[PDB]
Amino acid sequence: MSLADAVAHLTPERWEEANRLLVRKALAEFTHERLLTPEREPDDGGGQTYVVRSDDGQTAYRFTATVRALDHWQVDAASVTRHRDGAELPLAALDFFIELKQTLGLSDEILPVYLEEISSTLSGTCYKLTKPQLSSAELARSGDFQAVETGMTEGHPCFVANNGRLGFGIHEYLSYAPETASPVRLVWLAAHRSRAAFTAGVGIEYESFVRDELGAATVDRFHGVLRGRGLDPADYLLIPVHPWQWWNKLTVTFAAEVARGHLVCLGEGDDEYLAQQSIRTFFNASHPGKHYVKTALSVLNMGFMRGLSAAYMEATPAINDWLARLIEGDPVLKETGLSIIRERAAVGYRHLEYEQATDRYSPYRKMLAALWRESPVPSIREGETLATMASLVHQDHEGASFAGALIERSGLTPTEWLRHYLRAYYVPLLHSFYAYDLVYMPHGENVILVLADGVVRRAVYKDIAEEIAVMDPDAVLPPEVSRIAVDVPDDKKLLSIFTDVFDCFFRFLAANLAEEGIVTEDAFWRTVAEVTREYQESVPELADKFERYDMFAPEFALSCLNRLQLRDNRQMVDLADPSGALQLVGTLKNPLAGR
């Protein structure tokens, strides 16, 4: 049955494995965020047994872990056991959360919805366990950008409830989840110019842009659909839409717009897209050189509804143009090879009645918008391949690091390999901060690596307009881009590197490379220190600022990521409050300290 087929990945054996992996990560990351304080229990062999108890005291979780730099808890999956009233019990993620509800600060309101997000994340793991199990070495050897993108399993390495996609029924999961590599056809709407606005970056004009993307034949067909209803194509702008968004939302929530002819259904476009790790961003699988399309998707994932703001679209291209120009202008960013793939164009729809009915923060203002982003594909030479930076912290079904496999392929020492990666990825971030007070959101999903023979040649940053900030409230910026100017205490500025790079990315990378015996934490962090010191030696003009915002400070604040989602799982940061949802809980030892 297509009934039975749709749940064939939900079996006791895979459910067990899924629960073991998720509970392993719960113990590790909730210990990192100091929600749990595991108690040391009597010397087993040497490298350490621990116990975590329920709110109750009645249910015990025992495991082994190696504790690594940045208060990182490498909890052994195979070691986790559960005990109550003298007896062992099966590992069960739902029971974990009910049992540690108060320990974890889960409100009565959030718990039941959080458990849906857990339930959904576990299903996805079960789905991923049914797929062909490719080693880290096979995936590296493939050189296949979309094989890597869709082969990723973890998601965000910190958030536990990270792959919820709540709003997807099972059939929609199987059609739309990145890990399915299901081909998707975008739904195209005509949107009346009384309510839709198209914004073009330098070098973009609308009529040639849409003809390049859809082909002149499809544009002609769409013009015919409007003439057919007695409508003038000049009156309308083209908006591509996530099929989920069209069938579940715009046809109901925006029925008035469809009925009135403010919105007209044109059809599917021909090209087959693959959802990326972000879910609502599509890569063009038929024409890899064409643009990604970022769609409005009113689905809950990882602390936010994944809509797209019609208001932010107006400035989105200008912000990208400014960033690209700043990068071509800077000698250090040139040495580095840094580029972005620009958000090149954007369209937004202003639902006039919903604006009248909602504050400017409502998800109802984020139901209909899209932007186009350049493919990195046309920029690579022969011999080059592309990969999500997320791949560096990927471990295959045998625990083998994809970073490890790139090191193997490269023929370089681990530390030589790391120098090339850090020069490409990390040095731009240090220089953007010190020279321009510029920060990004540089996790695994927002960076693409260009690889030659297993070596990182250069990094490509994406997700620009909605993520970048300038940490100077009086920054002189072109009018259209000054909304990126933020006021942030001095106190918290360098947390952009310590939190987003060190605690939420390097911590996982150094640990996977240590556990697999490829390179010691000592040599990992020496290498970061050295590249850091060499960057600073090459720009003496910024000496004063290197001392003021010290990368080698003894300590910096623990910023907790799960704590945000546990306090509020629908908007885990108020996008309307002065960066002040951060949950800082004491300090971490800086691995760079004394270098």
Next chain:
Amino acid sequence: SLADAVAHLTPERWEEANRLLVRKALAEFTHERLLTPEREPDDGGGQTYVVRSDDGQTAYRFTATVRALDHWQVDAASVTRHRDGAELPLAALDFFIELKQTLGLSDEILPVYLEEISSTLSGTCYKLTKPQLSSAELARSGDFQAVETGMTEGHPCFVANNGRLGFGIHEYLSYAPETASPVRLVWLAAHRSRAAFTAGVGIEYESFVRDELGAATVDRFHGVLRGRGLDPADYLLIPVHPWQWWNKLTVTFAAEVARGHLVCLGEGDDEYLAQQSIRTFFNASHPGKHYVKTALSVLNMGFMRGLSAAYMEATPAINDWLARLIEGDPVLKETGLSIIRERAAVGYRHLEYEQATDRYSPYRKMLAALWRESPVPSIREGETLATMASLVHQDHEGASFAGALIERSGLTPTEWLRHYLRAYYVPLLHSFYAYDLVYMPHGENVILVLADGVVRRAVYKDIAEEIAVMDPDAVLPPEVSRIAVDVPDDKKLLSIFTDVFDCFFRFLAANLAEEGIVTEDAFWRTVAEVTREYQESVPELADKFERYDMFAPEFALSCLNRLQLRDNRQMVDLADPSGALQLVGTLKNPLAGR
């Protein structure tokens, strides 16, 4: 197919949908005293009124006839909208934004309520594309399900009444009653450690499910379980709304599917039609077989339409108790009253979600089903069935369906009304006065048995979850004592005044008067005669008749729309219905001085 699904959404149908809904909004919100129209005298022969927005800048203008029970027959074709001196299109979303403060819609509720408005309008657009049958063709047809799927209005008080929120447009087309789309149920095997089946008198499980599905189907179901390593003895069968399977059970209850607490058995062979309640299915393949009522986590008219696993245990016993009571009472026998029983019920208890929520949680209403016997086997040659909701049906010409039953009968409007009141309304007087027992007897909970256009007898449904005994000291069989309630004495007769008079007869007497069929005076005269004739026939309750006075000058105006507007997600709250009631002054009882 993309264009096919939105083909009902056109400017002309959307315009007509908005006109109808703003007409009803002006009407019912005026009835509930949220609006106070001003009289702009055209003559002094009455006629013409204005309502302003919260800011006073936008003016709504119409004509109405005010009838008994403060019923505002707002003429749909008269409604105009004006701002800064210019005419504007009637747009329902704009109506609600403009009167947000007047209507008491919170910042939190407004945007979700507007979705329910948008969805209600969409439905109207879709009903406007169906073959426009007249009340006379529908009444002549004798087709139970042509009538059921032929209704357009929905609840005649509630404006945001047909939202079905959580249906995507594809789901609207497959699942909404007005589509008459055949549905196949999805069958799950539910492990006995979490599922419990309960049977009324005369039901045993194994013969029951073979009767419903056939021996071959049950055998195949046993085959899917043995194929998987599982013993069929360990499992019960639960039928599920495919929406609930595809969107909720396969995701929210993923742990149950994966562990084999729930096993997917496939679709059932028989075709069902969604009834007006949306999650109750009539068996179109075998009309004589059971209705299936399903758990459906969608928002409609002030509630989620899930089904409580906890209430299923007592459902059949409450049904058996009411049937036996009806069978034993001479006044209820003379009336011809019967119920269609909720005969069987299964409930799933999700133990982890129990640990995580309080007993009121919708997480506990996600997997449960009951079976309700069909009325079809009980009818004789010459008899047809119709939802009581049809009496207040008006076709595309404004012609009352009740009117068309009167014409077919050859009876005077008044003779016709006696038969209807005897079958439907007397049993409600006798239940209150003799047993302190009330139902929820709106159009969707009553089926009429029809001979030659006449109401011969009435059949009640929605039983276990609706009925009350208004007496906390009632001695009732152990299983059925949860229907015992403490209601203040001064609110008891609101069961008749609110649910029958203000929420049904108000509409029926106005439709009949406006079409010129029979006057309000003669309508309410007949009601008063049948009330008096009931009371005369049972003199031992003379003292309860003076204590609960059906002919009192006045009773409280109980506002239905005010509840949905205060809370569109659970409009009646915790375990205290007598709690959320919004009483705003009084209505002139049309039985006053009779």
